[PDB]
Amino acid sequence: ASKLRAVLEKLKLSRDDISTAAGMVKGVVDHLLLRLKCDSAFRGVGLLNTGSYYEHVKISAPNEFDVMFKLEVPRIQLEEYSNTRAYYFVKFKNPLSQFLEGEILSASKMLSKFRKIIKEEGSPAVTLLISVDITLALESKSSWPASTQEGLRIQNWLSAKVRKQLRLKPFYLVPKHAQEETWRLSFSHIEKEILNNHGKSKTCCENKEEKCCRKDCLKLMKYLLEQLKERFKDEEHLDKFSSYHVKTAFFHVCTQNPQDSQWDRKDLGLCFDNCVTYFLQCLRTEKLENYFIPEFNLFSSNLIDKRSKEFLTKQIEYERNNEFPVFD
Ligand SMILES: Nc1ccc(-c2cc(Cl)c(Cl)c3[nH]c4c(c23)CN(C(=O)CO)CC4)cn1
Ligand SMILES: [Zn+2]
């Protein structure tokens, strides 16, 4: 209870120092974006909005930032790869013809040029050095792919109006490989909008009478994983897990507990325990549905070994029964 709020305060004091570092990262980005704009192939490159840096996977490592460069392109048509609901080949119907390999757009070819232009100056295409990961993403203004039709189950939490409005925004495709020329769907912009506008009430966390602990629970779940990943970094059974798994599980708990009253700031310990319990259930049953693509199991044996899940299950059960020693 009091231990949880002490961790958040230590995290908060850690964030203030990078306020000056933000402009330092934001300077390198504003430059690199201009240099990429001079190449004919990257004319329509820009920052993925709502903030230059998305502050990486690590809540406990403010030294490393994460930035996404979106590439506006003509109308995209997609071909699903091998029944994997998230990976696709990209096809056309001007300057990107150089990266064409028949009809399929070559991720390896565009990444190689993306890297060459920056060097002289693929989930992260380049990592600069205080680290900065840069991801190239294709912007598509088409309707969201069919695999997202039963995802984003926010209707009883953020309303069906908002889900309708959110699904009118573009989606994004990042060169991730399953096959070395597929692209992976990305909804980082939607995830940020949900986190920063998270309550059933439109004025959640806008006044002191409506302070919920939704954000604090996510910070704590991210800190728990990073601490465990750092403690057991040499054991290799936690390499697969990332903050995306914790964020995904958190969004399911929001769907599961849609009322702001279920996230009262004075129930932080119970609310954090709700997220820990749901994340364990996903580990034990090896089922963590992608929040936007319900058929993509993030905890499938294809992606993460069963022994890794029960290792993490074992460690989280330990921390839970010992009142989380890795926090102090
Ligand atoms: N093996 C994996 C893991 C996950 C996915 C994945 C899948 C979908 Cl559909 C979406 Cl929308 C995704 N967004 C992100 C990921 C992702 C993975 N990811 C990280 O793990 C951060 O280090 C970036 C953020 C596909 N393959
Ligand atoms: Zn709130």
Side-chain angles (χ1 to χ4, degrees):
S2 181
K3 179 189 297 299
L4 290 179
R5 212 151 292 177
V7 169
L8 292 165
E9 282 294 306
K10 180 205 301 176
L11 298 190
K12 182 187 299 298
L13 301 179
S14 186
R15 316 283 269 173
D16 206 313
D17 61 48
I18 49 94
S19 181
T20 76
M24 305 168 184
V25 157
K26 202 177 183 304
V28 179
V29 165
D30 288 335
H31 170 75
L32 273 186
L33 286 175
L34 241 56
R35 177 58 176 172
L36 288 162
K37 283 181 179 185
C38 287
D39 187 306
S40 303
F42 303 106
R43 290 269 146 77
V45 75
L47 272 176
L48 212 19
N49 54 52
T50 62
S52 37
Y53 65 94
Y54 282 157
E55 202 21 78
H56 208 244
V57 159
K58 283 273 167 290
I59 184 95
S60 61
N63 39 283
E64 43 208 54
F65 298 81
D66 201 274
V67 59
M68 267 188 172
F69 290 170
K70 69 183 191 67
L71 194 47
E72 307 177 82
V73 295
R75 188 155 195 80
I76 301 188
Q77 298 183 359
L78 301 173
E79 174 184 3
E80 179 174 358
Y81 164 74
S82 166
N83 293 313
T84 82
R85 296 285 180 270
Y87 298 89
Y88 295 83
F89 303 101
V90 175
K91 292 166 183 169
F92 54 103
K93 284 274 162 48
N94 200 334
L96 300 180
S97 54
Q98 40 183 299
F99 312 108
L100 252 182
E101 300 266 333
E103 323 287 20
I104 275 172
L105 176 58
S106 183
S108 301
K109 231 290 101 197
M110 188 182 306
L111 284 183
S112 302
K113 194 150 192 179
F114 189 76
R115 290 151 178 163
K116 280 179 182 293
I117 302 177
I118 302 170
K119 233 170 176 296
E120 303 162 8
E121 290 288 313
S123 179
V126 67
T127 169
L128 314 178
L129 307 181
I130 301 89
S131 171
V132 174
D133 288 325
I134 305 208
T135 292
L136 183 57
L138 303 180
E139 184 180 83
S140 172
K141 297 180 180 179
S142 300
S143 299
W144 288 15
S147 60
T148 67
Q149 204 142 36
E150 297 219 276
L152 198 59
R153 297 187 163 282
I154 69 178
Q155 299 91 320
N156 294 330
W157 165 31
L158 303 175
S159 85
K161 282 190 224 69
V162 169
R163 183 183 187 274
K164 190 98 62 183
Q165 288 303 111
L166 287 178
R167 291 178 62 91
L168 285 175
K169 301 168 182 283
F171 67 99
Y172 295 88
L173 296 144
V174 301
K176 207 50 183 179
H177 305 148
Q179 257 289 347
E180 203 193 22
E181 298 295 355
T182 53
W183 306 69
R184 217 236 302 111
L185 296 172
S186 171
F187 299 93
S188 305
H189 59 308
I190 306 299
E191 294 156 4
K192 180 161 198 171
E193 204 165 342
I194 289 172
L195 277 178
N196 296 332
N197 197 2
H198 52 248
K200 174 170 292 298
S201 165
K202 296 172 186 179
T203 51
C204 190
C205 296
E206 287 198 358
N207 57 80
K208 289 304 189 66
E209 288 72 48
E210 279 185 283
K211 284 295 177 179
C212 84
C213 68
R214 280 192 188 88
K215 274 186 173 182
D216 285 330
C217 286
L218 178 58
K219 288 193 180 75
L220 288 172
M221 286 292 291
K222 292 162 91 156
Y223 194 63
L224 173 64
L225 182 77
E226 297 166 16
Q227 293 296 89
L228 295 182
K229 279 173 59 63
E230 176 62 26
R231 162 64 170 82
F232 306 109
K233 64 190 167 188
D234 292 324
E235 285 181 66
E236 102 149 286
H237 290 96
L238 300 193
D239 302 347
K240 312 300 186 156
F241 300 100
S242 64
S243 69
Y244 193 68
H245 300 104
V246 143
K247 192 204 293 186
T248 301
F250 169 80
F251 283 148
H252 289 301
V253 184
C254 287
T255 293
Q256 170 183 311
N257 307 345
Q259 298 296 341
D260 297 346
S261 58
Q262 308 175 285
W263 298 93
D264 198 312
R265 60 172 294 99
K266 59 169 160 291
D267 296 345
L268 171 65
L270 176 60
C271 298
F272 172 65
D273 182 73
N274 293 339
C275 302
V276 174
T277 295
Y278 183 86
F279 194 75
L280 281 166
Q281 171 182 317
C282 295
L283 282 173
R284 298 172 186 179
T285 69
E286 308 183 357
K287 298 181 191 175
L288 178 54
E289 300 179 7
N290 187 281
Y291 198 69
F292 301 82
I293 311 182
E295 279 174 294
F296 193 87
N297 191 344
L298 300 160
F299 285 173
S300 71
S301 46
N302 198 327
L303 295 175
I304 310 184
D305 257 24
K306 166 168 191 183
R307 186 168 331 195
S308 309
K309 281 86 132 281
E310 53 212 17
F311 182 95
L312 182 53
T313 310
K314 183 64 153 298
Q315 289 315 307
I316 289 174
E317 289 180 346
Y318 169 80
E319 303 289 325
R320 178 152 175 253
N321 304 339
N322 295 258
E323 284 133 335
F324 302 93
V326 294
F327 275 169
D328 45 72

PDB file of all heavy atoms in Angstrom, residues 57 86-87 184-187 242 244 290 293 296 298 303, ligand 1:
ATOM      1  N   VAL A  57      10.048   1.432 -23.934  1.00  0.00           N
ATOM      2  CA  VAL A  57       9.433   0.364 -23.159  1.00  0.00           C
ATOM      3  C   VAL A  57       9.721   0.519 -21.663  1.00  0.00           C
ATOM      4  O   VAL A  57       8.890   0.147 -20.823  1.00  0.00           O
ATOM      5  CB  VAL A  57       9.932  -0.979 -23.724  1.00  0.00           C
ATOM      6  CG1 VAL A  57       9.777  -2.101 -22.723  1.00  0.00           C
ATOM      7  CG2 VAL A  57       9.207  -1.306 -25.033  1.00  0.00           C
ATOM      8  N   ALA A  86      -1.502 -10.459 -37.973  1.00  0.00           N
ATOM      9  CA  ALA A  86      -0.835  -9.176 -37.803  1.00  0.00           C
ATOM     10  C   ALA A  86       0.162  -8.832 -38.900  1.00  0.00           C
ATOM     11  O   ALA A  86       0.457  -7.648 -39.086  1.00  0.00           O
ATOM     12  CB  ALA A  86      -0.112  -9.130 -36.450  1.00  0.00           C
ATOM     13  N   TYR A  87       0.684  -9.819 -39.624  1.00  0.00           N
ATOM     14  CA  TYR A  87       1.715  -9.586 -40.628  1.00  0.00           C
ATOM     15  C   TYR A  87       1.114  -9.585 -42.027  1.00  0.00           C
ATOM     16  O   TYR A  87       0.238 -10.397 -42.339  1.00  0.00           O
ATOM     17  CB  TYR A  87       2.817 -10.641 -40.530  1.00  0.00           C
ATOM     18  CG  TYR A  87       3.539 -10.633 -39.204  1.00  0.00           C
ATOM     19  CD1 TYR A  87       3.079 -11.397 -38.141  1.00  0.00           C
ATOM     20  CD2 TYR A  87       4.674  -9.858 -39.012  1.00  0.00           C
ATOM     21  CE1 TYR A  87       3.732 -11.393 -36.924  1.00  0.00           C
ATOM     22  CE2 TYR A  87       5.334  -9.848 -37.798  1.00  0.00           C
ATOM     23  CZ  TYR A  87       4.859 -10.617 -36.758  1.00  0.00           C
ATOM     24  OH  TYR A  87       5.513 -10.610 -35.548  1.00  0.00           O
ATOM     25  N   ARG A 184       4.012  -5.382 -39.894  1.00  0.00           N
ATOM     26  CA  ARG A 184       3.174  -5.626 -38.730  1.00  0.00           C
ATOM     27  C   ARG A 184       2.282  -4.420 -38.473  1.00  0.00           C
ATOM     28  O   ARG A 184       2.717  -3.273 -38.616  1.00  0.00           O
ATOM     29  CB  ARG A 184       4.032  -5.914 -37.497  1.00  0.00           C
ATOM     30  CG  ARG A 184       3.456  -6.967 -36.577  1.00  0.00           C
ATOM     31  CD  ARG A 184       3.297  -6.440 -35.163  1.00  0.00           C
ATOM     32  NE  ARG A 184       4.551  -5.970 -34.579  1.00  0.00           N
ATOM     33  CZ  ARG A 184       4.824  -4.694 -34.320  1.00  0.00           C
ATOM     34  NH1 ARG A 184       3.928  -3.753 -34.590  1.00  0.00           N
ATOM     35  NH2 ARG A 184       5.989  -4.357 -33.786  1.00  0.00           N
ATOM     36  N   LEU A 185       1.033  -4.683 -38.102  1.00  0.00           N
ATOM     37  CA  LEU A 185       0.119  -3.604 -37.765  1.00  0.00           C
ATOM     38  C   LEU A 185       0.570  -2.911 -36.485  1.00  0.00           C
ATOM     39  O   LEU A 185       1.152  -3.531 -35.592  1.00  0.00           O
ATOM     40  CB  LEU A 185      -1.303  -4.142 -37.603  1.00  0.00           C
ATOM     41  CG  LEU A 185      -1.946  -4.729 -38.860  1.00  0.00           C
ATOM     42  CD1 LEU A 185      -3.262  -5.410 -38.529  1.00  0.00           C
ATOM     43  CD2 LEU A 185      -2.156  -3.640 -39.897  1.00  0.00           C
ATOM     44  N   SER A 186       0.296  -1.609 -36.401  1.00  0.00           N
ATOM     45  CA  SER A 186       0.673  -0.813 -35.239  1.00  0.00           C
ATOM     46  C   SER A 186      -0.454   0.146 -34.891  1.00  0.00           C
ATOM     47  O   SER A 186      -0.989   0.821 -35.776  1.00  0.00           O
ATOM     48  CB  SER A 186       1.967  -0.031 -35.502  1.00  0.00           C
ATOM     49  OG  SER A 186       2.222   0.898 -34.458  1.00  0.00           O
ATOM     50  N   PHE A 187      -0.798   0.220 -33.603  1.00  0.00           N
ATOM     51  CA  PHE A 187      -1.833   1.134 -33.132  1.00  0.00           C
ATOM     52  C   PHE A 187      -1.341   1.983 -31.964  1.00  0.00           C
ATOM     53  O   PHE A 187      -2.122   2.316 -31.063  1.00  0.00           O
ATOM     54  CB  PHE A 187      -3.100   0.369 -32.743  1.00  0.00           C
ATOM     55  CG  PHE A 187      -3.719  -0.387 -33.878  1.00  0.00           C
ATOM     56  CD1 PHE A 187      -3.390  -1.713 -34.099  1.00  0.00           C
ATOM     57  CD2 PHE A 187      -4.621   0.229 -34.732  1.00  0.00           C
ATOM     58  CE1 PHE A 187      -3.954  -2.415 -35.146  1.00  0.00           C
ATOM     59  CE2 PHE A 187      -5.190  -0.469 -35.779  1.00  0.00           C
ATOM     60  CZ  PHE A 187      -4.857  -1.794 -35.986  1.00  0.00           C
ATOM     61  N   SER A 242       7.781  -8.034 -22.813  1.00  0.00           N
ATOM     62  CA  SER A 242       8.034  -6.606 -22.938  1.00  0.00           C
ATOM     63  C   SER A 242       6.889  -5.843 -22.284  1.00  0.00           C
ATOM     64  O   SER A 242       5.903  -6.430 -21.824  1.00  0.00           O
ATOM     65  CB  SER A 242       8.201  -6.200 -24.407  1.00  0.00           C
ATOM     66  OG  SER A 242       7.003  -6.413 -25.131  1.00  0.00           O
ATOM     67  N   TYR A 244       4.774  -4.192 -23.785  1.00  0.00           N
ATOM     68  CA  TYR A 244       3.567  -4.303 -24.593  1.00  0.00           C
ATOM     69  C   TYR A 244       2.636  -5.372 -24.041  1.00  0.00           C
ATOM     70  O   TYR A 244       1.410  -5.215 -24.078  1.00  0.00           O
ATOM     71  CB  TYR A 244       3.920  -4.600 -26.049  1.00  0.00           C
ATOM     72  CG  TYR A 244       2.736  -4.420 -26.968  1.00  0.00           C
ATOM     73  CD1 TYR A 244       2.207  -3.157 -27.199  1.00  0.00           C
ATOM     74  CD2 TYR A 244       2.140  -5.508 -27.594  1.00  0.00           C
ATOM     75  CE1 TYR A 244       1.123  -2.979 -28.028  1.00  0.00           C
ATOM     76  CE2 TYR A 244       1.052  -5.339 -28.427  1.00  0.00           C
ATOM     77  CZ  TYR A 244       0.548  -4.070 -28.641  1.00  0.00           C
ATOM     78  OH  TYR A 244      -0.536  -3.880 -29.466  1.00  0.00           O
ATOM     79  N   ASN A 290      -4.070  -9.871 -28.325  1.00  0.00           N
ATOM     80  CA  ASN A 290      -3.811  -8.494 -28.718  1.00  0.00           C
ATOM     81  C   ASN A 290      -5.091  -7.680 -28.589  1.00  0.00           C
ATOM     82  O   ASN A 290      -6.171  -8.127 -28.986  1.00  0.00           O
ATOM     83  CB  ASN A 290      -3.291  -8.433 -30.151  1.00  0.00           C
ATOM     84  CG  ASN A 290      -2.837  -7.043 -30.543  1.00  0.00           C
ATOM     85  OD1 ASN A 290      -3.649  -6.179 -30.867  1.00  0.00           O
ATOM     86  ND2 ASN A 290      -1.531  -6.818 -30.505  1.00  0.00           N
ATOM     87  N   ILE A 293      -6.310  -6.956 -32.110  1.00  0.00           N
ATOM     88  CA  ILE A 293      -6.466  -8.137 -32.953  1.00  0.00           C
ATOM     89  C   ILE A 293      -6.687  -9.340 -32.047  1.00  0.00           C
ATOM     90  O   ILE A 293      -5.716  -9.952 -31.582  1.00  0.00           O
ATOM     91  CB  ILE A 293      -5.244  -8.335 -33.860  1.00  0.00           C
ATOM     92  CG1 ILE A 293      -4.903  -7.027 -34.571  1.00  0.00           C
ATOM     93  CG2 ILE A 293      -5.515  -9.422 -34.870  1.00  0.00           C
ATOM     94  CD1 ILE A 293      -3.747  -7.144 -35.512  1.00  0.00           C
ATOM     95  N   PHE A 296      -4.650 -12.766 -32.532  1.00  0.00           N
ATOM     96  CA  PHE A 296      -3.201 -12.803 -32.352  1.00  0.00           C
ATOM     97  C   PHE A 296      -2.903 -13.028 -30.876  1.00  0.00           C
ATOM     98  O   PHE A 296      -2.996 -12.107 -30.062  1.00  0.00           O
ATOM     99  CB  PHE A 296      -2.563 -11.511 -32.850  1.00  0.00           C
ATOM    100  CG  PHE A 296      -1.072 -11.589 -32.994  1.00  0.00           C
ATOM    101  CD1 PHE A 296      -0.506 -12.046 -34.171  1.00  0.00           C
ATOM    102  CD2 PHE A 296      -0.235 -11.205 -31.958  1.00  0.00           C
ATOM    103  CE1 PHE A 296       0.866 -12.119 -34.314  1.00  0.00           C
ATOM    104  CE2 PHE A 296       1.139 -11.276 -32.097  1.00  0.00           C
ATOM    105  CZ  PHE A 296       1.689 -11.734 -33.276  1.00  0.00           C
ATOM    106  N   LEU A 298      -0.515 -13.210 -28.056  1.00  0.00           N
ATOM    107  CA  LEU A 298       0.848 -12.819 -27.719  1.00  0.00           C
ATOM    108  C   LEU A 298       1.550 -13.859 -26.856  1.00  0.00           C
ATOM    109  O   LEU A 298       2.784 -13.890 -26.830  1.00  0.00           O
ATOM    110  CB  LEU A 298       0.842 -11.469 -27.006  1.00  0.00           C
ATOM    111  CG  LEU A 298       0.246 -10.316 -27.809  1.00  0.00           C
ATOM    112  CD1 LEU A 298      -0.144  -9.189 -26.880  1.00  0.00           C
ATOM    113  CD2 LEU A 298       1.234  -9.823 -28.848  1.00  0.00           C
ATOM    114  N   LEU A 303       5.382 -17.881 -30.195  1.00  0.00           N
ATOM    115  CA  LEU A 303       6.146 -16.671 -29.924  1.00  0.00           C
ATOM    116  C   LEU A 303       6.973 -16.771 -28.649  1.00  0.00           C
ATOM    117  O   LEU A 303       8.102 -16.268 -28.605  1.00  0.00           O
ATOM    118  CB  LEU A 303       5.207 -15.466 -29.842  1.00  0.00           C
ATOM    119  CG  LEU A 303       4.463 -15.091 -31.119  1.00  0.00           C
ATOM    120  CD1 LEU A 303       3.492 -13.957 -30.845  1.00  0.00           C
ATOM    121  CD2 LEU A 303       5.435 -14.707 -32.228  1.00  0.00           C
TER     122      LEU A 303
HETATM  123  N1  LIG B   1       6.059 -11.597 -31.390  1.00  0.00           N
HETATM  124  C1  LIG B   1       5.186 -10.439 -31.466  1.00  0.00           C
HETATM  125  C2  LIG B   1       4.952  -9.650 -30.356  1.00  0.00           C
HETATM  126  C3  LIG B   1       4.120  -8.554 -30.471  1.00  0.00           C
HETATM  127  C4  LIG B   1       3.567  -8.297 -31.710  1.00  0.00           C
HETATM  128  C5  LIG B   1       2.626  -7.138 -31.968  1.00  0.00           C
HETATM  129  C6  LIG B   1       1.482  -7.458 -32.655  1.00  0.00           C
HETATM  130  C7  LIG B   1       0.571  -6.460 -32.939  1.00  0.00           C
HETATM  131 CL1  LIG B   1      -0.928  -6.834 -33.802  1.00  0.00          CL
HETATM  132  C8  LIG B   1       0.795  -5.173 -32.545  1.00  0.00           C
HETATM  133 CL2  LIG B   1      -0.486  -4.033 -32.968  1.00  0.00          CL
HETATM  134  C9  LIG B   1       1.969  -4.835 -31.849  1.00  0.00           C
HETATM  135  N2  LIG B   1       2.445  -3.663 -31.359  1.00  0.00           N
HETATM  136  C10 LIG B   1       3.633  -3.872 -30.753  1.00  0.00           C
HETATM  137  C11 LIG B   1       3.956  -5.168 -30.853  1.00  0.00           C
HETATM  138  C12 LIG B   1       2.880  -5.809 -31.561  1.00  0.00           C
HETATM  139  C13 LIG B   1       5.305  -5.671 -30.244  1.00  0.00           C
HETATM  140  N3  LIG B   1       6.139  -4.594 -29.659  1.00  0.00           N
HETATM  141  C14 LIG B   1       7.066  -4.865 -28.581  1.00  0.00           C
HETATM  142  O1  LIG B   1       7.141  -5.964 -28.179  1.00  0.00           O
HETATM  143  C15 LIG B   1       7.932  -3.758 -27.967  1.00  0.00           C
HETATM  144  O2  LIG B   1       9.243  -4.201 -27.732  1.00  0.00           O
HETATM  145  C16 LIG B   1       5.945  -3.289 -30.218  1.00  0.00           C
HETATM  146  C17 LIG B   1       4.528  -2.880 -30.085  1.00  0.00           C
HETATM  147  C18 LIG B   1       3.835  -9.134 -32.757  1.00  0.00           C
HETATM  148  N4  LIG B   1       4.631 -10.159 -32.617  1.00  0.00           N
END
